[PDB]
Design an enzyme around this catalytic site. Sequence first.
Site, PDB file in Angstrom:
ATOM      1  N   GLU A  83       0.830  -1.198   0.000  1.00  0.00           N
ATOM      2  CA  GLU A  83       0.000   0.000   0.000  1.00  0.00           C
ATOM      3  C   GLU A  83       0.868   1.252   0.000  1.00  0.00           C
ATOM      4  O   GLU A  83       0.391   2.355   0.315  1.00  0.00           O
ATOM      5  CB  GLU A  83      -1.011  -0.003   1.155  1.00  0.00           C
ATOM      6  CG  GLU A  83      -0.406  -0.080   2.517  1.00  0.00           C
ATOM      7  CD  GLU A  83      -1.421   0.118   3.587  1.00  0.00           C
ATOM      8  OE1 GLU A  83      -1.849  -0.905   4.162  1.00  0.00           O
ATOM      9  OE2 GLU A  83      -1.785   1.295   3.850  1.00  0.00           O
ATOM     10  N   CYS A 115      -3.548  -3.799   4.173  1.00  0.00           N
ATOM     11  CA  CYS A 115      -2.659  -4.839   4.691  1.00  0.00           C
ATOM     12  C   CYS A 115      -2.994  -6.239   4.203  1.00  0.00           C
ATOM     13  O   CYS A 115      -2.327  -7.187   4.639  1.00  0.00           O
ATOM     14  CB  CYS A 115      -2.664  -4.830   6.225  1.00  0.00           C
ATOM     15  SG  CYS A 115      -2.030  -3.305   6.868  1.00  0.00           S
ATOM     16  N   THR A 158       2.286   3.144  16.220  1.00  0.00           N
ATOM     17  CA  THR A 158       2.153   1.868  15.540  1.00  0.00           C
ATOM     18  C   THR A 158       2.857   1.868  14.182  1.00  0.00           C
ATOM     19  O   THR A 158       2.680   0.930  13.400  1.00  0.00           O
ATOM     20  CB  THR A 158       0.679   1.461  15.381  1.00  0.00           C
ATOM     21  OG1 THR A 158       0.007   2.319  14.430  1.00  0.00           O
ATOM     22  CG2 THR A 158      -0.075   1.512  16.727  1.00  0.00           C
ATOM     23  N   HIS A 250      -2.661 -10.801  11.556  1.00  0.00           N
ATOM     24  CA  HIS A 250      -2.166  -9.481  11.200  1.00  0.00           C
ATOM     25  C   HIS A 250      -1.914  -8.668  12.462  1.00  0.00           C
ATOM     26  O   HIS A 250      -2.772  -8.582  13.348  1.00  0.00           O
ATOM     27  CB  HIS A 250      -3.163  -8.773  10.283  1.00  0.00           C
ATOM     28  CG  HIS A 250      -2.813  -7.347  10.032  1.00  0.00           C
ATOM     29  ND1 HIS A 250      -1.594  -6.962   9.496  1.00  0.00           N
ATOM     30  CD2 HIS A 250      -3.502  -6.209  10.273  1.00  0.00           C
ATOM     31  CE1 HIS A 250      -1.549  -5.642   9.447  1.00  0.00           C
ATOM     32  NE2 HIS A 250      -2.699  -5.165   9.898  1.00  0.00           N
ATOM     33  N   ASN A 309       4.182  -1.804  12.741  1.00  0.00           N
ATOM     34  CA  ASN A 309       3.306  -2.219  11.639  1.00  0.00           C
ATOM     35  C   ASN A 309       4.075  -2.099  10.324  1.00  0.00           C
ATOM     36  O   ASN A 309       4.581  -1.019   9.985  1.00  0.00           O
ATOM     37  CB  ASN A 309       2.042  -1.361  11.593  1.00  0.00           C
ATOM     38  CG  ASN A 309       0.902  -2.006  10.793  1.00  0.00           C
ATOM     39  OD1 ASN A 309       1.075  -3.024  10.119  1.00  0.00           O
ATOM     40  ND2 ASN A 309      -0.280  -1.412  10.886  1.00  0.00           N
ATOM     41  N   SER A 342      -7.595  -3.017   5.908  1.00  0.00           N
ATOM     42  CA  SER A 342      -8.625  -1.988   5.998  1.00  0.00           C
ATOM     43  C   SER A 342      -9.213  -1.690   4.624  1.00  0.00           C
ATOM     44  O   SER A 342      -8.545  -1.810   3.603  1.00  0.00           O
ATOM     45  CB  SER A 342      -8.031  -0.709   6.567  1.00  0.00           C
ATOM     46  OG  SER A 342      -7.845  -0.818   7.970  1.00  0.00           O
TER      47      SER A 342
HETATM   48  C1  LIG Z   1      -4.570   1.592  18.083  1.00  0.00           C
HETATM   49  C2  LIG Z   1      -5.006   3.033  18.327  1.00  0.00           C
HETATM   50  C3  LIG Z   1      -6.491   3.222  18.010  1.00  0.00           C
HETATM   51  C4  LIG Z   1      -4.764   3.296  19.808  1.00  0.00           C
HETATM   52  O1  LIG Z   1      -4.697   4.679  19.974  1.00  0.00           O
HETATM   53  P1  LIG Z   1      -5.403   5.428  21.232  1.00  0.00           P
HETATM   54  O2  LIG Z   1      -6.861   5.730  21.030  1.00  0.00           O
HETATM   55  O3  LIG Z   1      -4.567   6.665  21.494  1.00  0.00           O
HETATM   56  O4  LIG Z   1      -5.142   4.398  22.441  1.00  0.00           O
HETATM   57  P2  LIG Z   1      -6.258   3.780  23.458  1.00  0.00           P
HETATM   58  O5  LIG Z   1      -6.876   4.863  24.332  1.00  0.00           O
HETATM   59  O6  LIG Z   1      -7.213   2.966  22.631  1.00  0.00           O
HETATM   60  O7  LIG Z   1      -5.286   2.867  24.401  1.00  0.00           O
HETATM   61  C5  LIG Z   1      -4.744   1.696  23.869  1.00  0.00           C
HETATM   62  C6  LIG Z   1      -4.532   0.719  25.054  1.00  0.00           C
HETATM   63  O8  LIG Z   1      -3.626   1.253  25.867  1.00  0.00           O
HETATM   64  C7  LIG Z   1      -4.184   1.153  27.321  1.00  0.00           C
HETATM   65  N1  LIG Z   1      -3.402   2.040  28.149  1.00  0.00           N
HETATM   66  C8  LIG Z   1      -3.474   3.378  28.008  1.00  0.00           C
HETATM   67  N2  LIG Z   1      -2.646   3.937  28.912  1.00  0.00           N
HETATM   68  C9  LIG Z   1      -2.078   2.927  29.590  1.00  0.00           C
HETATM   69  C10 LIG Z   1      -1.172   2.924  30.615  1.00  0.00           C
HETATM   70  N3  LIG Z   1      -0.592   4.057  31.250  1.00  0.00           N
HETATM   71  N4  LIG Z   1      -0.765   1.797  31.153  1.00  0.00           N
HETATM   72  C11 LIG Z   1      -1.229   0.612  30.638  1.00  0.00           C
HETATM   73  N5  LIG Z   1      -2.104   0.577  29.603  1.00  0.00           N
HETATM   74  C12 LIG Z   1      -2.525   1.762  29.102  1.00  0.00           C
HETATM   75  C13 LIG Z   1      -5.474   1.416  27.115  1.00  0.00           C
HETATM   76  O9  LIG Z   1      -6.325   1.029  28.275  1.00  0.00           O
HETATM   77  C14 LIG Z   1      -5.800   0.532  25.903  1.00  0.00           C
HETATM   78  O10 LIG Z   1      -5.908  -0.773  26.296  1.00  0.00           O
HETATM   79  P3  LIG Z   1      -6.954  -1.830  25.596  1.00  0.00           P
HETATM   80  O11 LIG Z   1      -8.199  -1.093  25.207  1.00  0.00           O
HETATM   81  O12 LIG Z   1      -6.290  -2.358  24.375  1.00  0.00           O
HETATM   82  O13 LIG Z   1      -7.306  -2.932  26.539  1.00  0.00           O
HETATM   83  C15 LIG Z   1      -4.197   4.022  17.477  1.00  0.00           C
HETATM   84  O14 LIG Z   1      -2.826   3.784  17.704  1.00  0.00           O
HETATM   85  C16 LIG Z   1      -4.494   3.925  15.980  1.00  0.00           C
HETATM   86  O15 LIG Z   1      -5.417   4.475  15.441  1.00  0.00           O
HETATM   87  N6  LIG Z   1      -3.587   3.110  15.239  1.00  0.00           N
HETATM   88  C17 LIG Z   1      -3.721   2.929  13.810  1.00  0.00           C
HETATM   89  C18 LIG Z   1      -4.886   2.032  13.476  1.00  0.00           C
HETATM   90  C19 LIG Z   1      -4.656   0.567  13.834  1.00  0.00           C
HETATM   91  O16 LIG Z   1      -3.591   0.053  14.047  1.00  0.00           O
HETATM   92  N7  LIG Z   1      -5.852  -0.217  13.878  1.00  0.00           N
HETATM   93  C20 LIG Z   1      -5.796  -1.630  14.131  1.00  0.00           C
HETATM   94  C21 LIG Z   1      -6.982  -2.307  13.429  1.00  0.00           C
HETATM   95  S1  LIG Z   1      -7.063  -1.967  11.639  1.00  0.00           S
HETATM   96  C22 LIG Z   1      -5.661  -2.825  10.939  1.00  0.00           C
HETATM   97  O17 LIG Z   1      -5.052  -3.624  11.571  1.00  0.00           O
HETATM   98  C23 LIG Z   1      -5.340  -2.452   9.505  1.00  0.00           C
HETATM   99  C24 LIG Z   1      -4.155  -1.490   9.440  1.00  0.00           C
HETATM  100  C25 LIG Z   1      -4.188  -0.363  10.469  1.00  0.00           C
HETATM  101  O18 LIG Z   1      -2.990  -2.199   9.730  1.00  0.00           O
HETATM  102  C26 LIG Z   1      -4.180  -0.753   8.101  1.00  0.00           C
HETATM  103  C27 LIG Z   1      -4.247  -1.535   6.800  1.00  0.00           C
HETATM  104  O19 LIG Z   1      -4.791  -2.656   6.616  1.00  0.00           O
HETATM  105  O20 LIG Z   1      -3.697  -0.956   5.826  1.00  0.00           O
END
Ligand SMILES: CC(C)(COP(=O)([O-])OP(=O)([O-])OC[C@H]1O[C@@H](n2cnc3c(N)ncnc32)[C@H](O)[C@@H]1OP(=O)([O-])[O-])[C@@H](O)C(=O)NCCC(=O)NCCSC(=O)C[C@@](C)(O)CC(=O)[O-]
Lengths: 418, 418
Positions: A83, A115, A158, A250, A309, A342
Amino acid sequence: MKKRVGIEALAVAVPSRYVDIEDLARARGVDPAKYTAGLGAREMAVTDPGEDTVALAATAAARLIRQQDVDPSRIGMLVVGTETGIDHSKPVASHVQGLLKLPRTMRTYDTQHACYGGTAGLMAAVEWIASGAGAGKVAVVVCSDIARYGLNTAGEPTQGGGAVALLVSEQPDLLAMDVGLNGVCSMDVYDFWRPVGRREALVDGHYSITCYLEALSGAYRGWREKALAAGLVRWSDALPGEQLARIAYHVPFCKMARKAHTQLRLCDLEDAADAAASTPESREAQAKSAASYDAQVATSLGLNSRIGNVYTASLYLALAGLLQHEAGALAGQRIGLLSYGSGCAAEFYSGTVGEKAAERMAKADLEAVLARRERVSIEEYERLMKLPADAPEAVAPSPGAFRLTEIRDHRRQYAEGN
Amino acid sequence: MKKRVGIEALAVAVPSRYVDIEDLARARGVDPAKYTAGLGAREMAVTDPGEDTVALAATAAARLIRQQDVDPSRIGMLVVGTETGIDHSKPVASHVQGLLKLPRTMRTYDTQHACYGGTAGLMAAVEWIASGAGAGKVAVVVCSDIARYGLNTAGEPTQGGGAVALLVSEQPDLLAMDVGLNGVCSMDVYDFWRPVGRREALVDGHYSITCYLEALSGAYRGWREKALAAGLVRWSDALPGEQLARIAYHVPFCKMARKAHTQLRLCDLEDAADAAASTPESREAQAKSAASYDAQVATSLGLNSRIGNVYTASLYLALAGLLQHEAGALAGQRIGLLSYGSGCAAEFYSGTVGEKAAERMAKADLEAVLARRERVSIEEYERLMKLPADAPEAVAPSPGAFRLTEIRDHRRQYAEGN
Ligand SMILES: CC(C)(COP(=O)([O-])OP(=O)([O-])OC[C@H]1O[C@@H](n2cnc3c(N)ncnc32)[C@H](O)[C@@H]1OP(=O)([O-])[O-])[C@@H](O)C(=O)NCCC(=O)NCCSC(=O)C[C@@](C)(O)CC(=O)[O-]
Ligand SMILES: CC(C)(COP(=O)([O-])OP(=O)([O-])OC[C@H]1O[C@@H](n2cnc3c(N)ncnc32)[C@H](O)[C@@H]1OP(=O)([O-])[O-])[C@@H](O)C(=O)NCCC(=O)NCCSC(=O)C[C@@](C)(O)CC(=O)[O-]
């Protein structure tokens, strides 16, 4: 005469630099435990413009050919799943062919679906062989990507980059795939995307997690139905998915694998003929089983946690980490793999690890690949991020690796390391 | 039980507007005969931004499903071959799936290698079926593109746009393909390309002709060797290539087909066991045979001459024009097809036209597709060319067709015509 088709071997390329994920948290005013515990990250690969999609793909594919002693004239398909394309017309695969000085009797093209693109190309290569068209030949399918969300964005921790090159053949020493048993689930969504002319991805992060899990559920269920009918798994005292020795997913971030495995197990628990005797609470507690995650998933994340990633390559880096250490133990056992992209699409498939998988993994020499990298500061990561795509740093590639050197008259130029 | 796989049916979508090619010549200070005789053009499709790659692909794929009464739930692969991608991650195929309201049990992805991308996806679908994985299901492979070289460029009179949707199945009424007999020839070149962020292609035009012919020669020779070994052609009083009833070629401009056919025949004449008794002059005169071109190629260009280069779709528009009028006569006969993409790769393959090909072509109703268009001025073509990609004209799509309407918060929005 039992015919087999699948992955014979793999090779990995990573960028020359990485950052410590706790340094990134501090630079962003974030608790480092959000990244190390919340996401499961340790180190994040970072790039400069010389480490483009072509350079990483060519490094991985050349390494595969050298490490595995592939006869280049036996390659009848070279496909790059990405991608992170660099031309609307000219495919990364054509550049890789040239850089590696490969001969002419092969299909070349790129595949695209976030991905999932690498998996799409893998299936095209596998089915080319299994149809008979590729009998006597091999394919090389390279998953190559650079994941960029941007400074101060939720997706930033990530990020990652690199490439995994897969050798596909009738001698599938790593994974003899179960042809025709795949499950698939796809639907048109805007969970994550990257318009032409945007260097950084757009994402609705929590929705993207829901989409991954939804598509996983459909893909896994479709595979399970076919595996039941083929007699490979049964509804017994063990759940169907427990009969797979391992499951690789993944990996956009390492904690996603636990979420994915819990959902897969929930699919079994919700669908069992006796599900009415359970509750959401009892099903969730069973689905989240630490024992199952530890037995089937945990050891697949060692490389991913140190890279980030790598989009199309993330599932294959998980496969690599699993087999790096457990290939001999897994020989003769069936494992499952879940690919997600995605946009979106998921595909779940299975295969049996080969007797010679340990040999092929030893030749991939993966700890040496990871050892060559150097750590840099967040400041330097940011400086490199800000460089335009046509401004590679003046550094040589490592031996047998490649870098973009310049763009001249709209033609990309590359160097091979001595 | 003789199993068959290949193309069951096709559908075509074209932009709503075109220009007369002689009007373009006059606007450019060019002798109109350069375009009508030199290139073989008659009318050139022109677009506005509402007719994007997705809208054209979805129009063609929806038309295929309606005209051929396809059960959408039998589709297990939806692939779009394109070099006019609109997102780095999210594939045209995912948008098409959504616009058509297709169900979930299918792979979706795009394939990329200049004008070869559609063929790459066709082979992936054919081999998915022939491997057994797709048994009982069908695939839809859509070739969709908009060819843009720019005002006052040498490539401008070869522009065009549109889409061809192919139904791929175990009931290949149009073309039962000879699995495993393909010839292929690919090498890394810069004959034509389009960097990310450039709306118009870059091309070294005469070199691109040499590259097409070179790759054609290798691909054709590879097929011929396999066809000889399979007993489908022989070195007899007739040249091997003369034993194909028809040959269809990638059509960047209509006169290219004559150049291609002459080269194919030269491959036979240069390779014949008795070639030493000929001269370049005698071989060229025989290769250029008007009788052979008239018998094998001439009737394949009627649609192409009225549309222009549609990149991945050009070869399939030639197949469409041939079968539109000759499907009944061709039933039971083997034909050849040559796909080329700059960058580059060529693949030559063969198949047998089916008994029901005439039925499937009648349902495609191709003269009605072409009749819906309107002619515009060069001035208006230029005005529309200058519109940004996010600025579609405020016009409704035709019944069952689609248009891009706007981009809002980076999400592309579409309308379906009533
Ligand atoms: C992954 C998000 C959403 C997270 O970003 P965010 O919203 O800032 O983080 P959050 O509030 O969701 O926190 C993540 C985890 O950290 C925890 N946490 C928080 N603070 C602490 C602390 N002090 N001590 C211990 N733990 C802590 C928190 O409780 C939570 O735990 P969980 O809900 O998993 O149980 C963001 O990084 C993002 O948008 N990333 C990009 C999208 C992504 O990776 N999505 C995955 C699914 S889609 C996919 O895999 C396809 C993709 C993305 O690879 C693209 C493609 O195919 O091309
Ligand atoms: C095709 C070119 C190079 C031509 O552009 P040009 O250089 O301006 O034209 P020319 O000087 O080569 O003339 C063309 C023909 O017109 C003749 N002619 C001239 N004047 C007259 C006249 N008064 N009366 C009668 N005839 C006349 C002239 O003699 C010649 O005849 P030919 O050499 O064919 O025998 C240009 O349009 C171009 O660059 N097009 C784009 C590239 C292209 O289509 N290449 C084809 C091969 S590569 C391919 O097919 C892949 C592609 C392009 O589709 C991309 C992909 O895969 O993504």
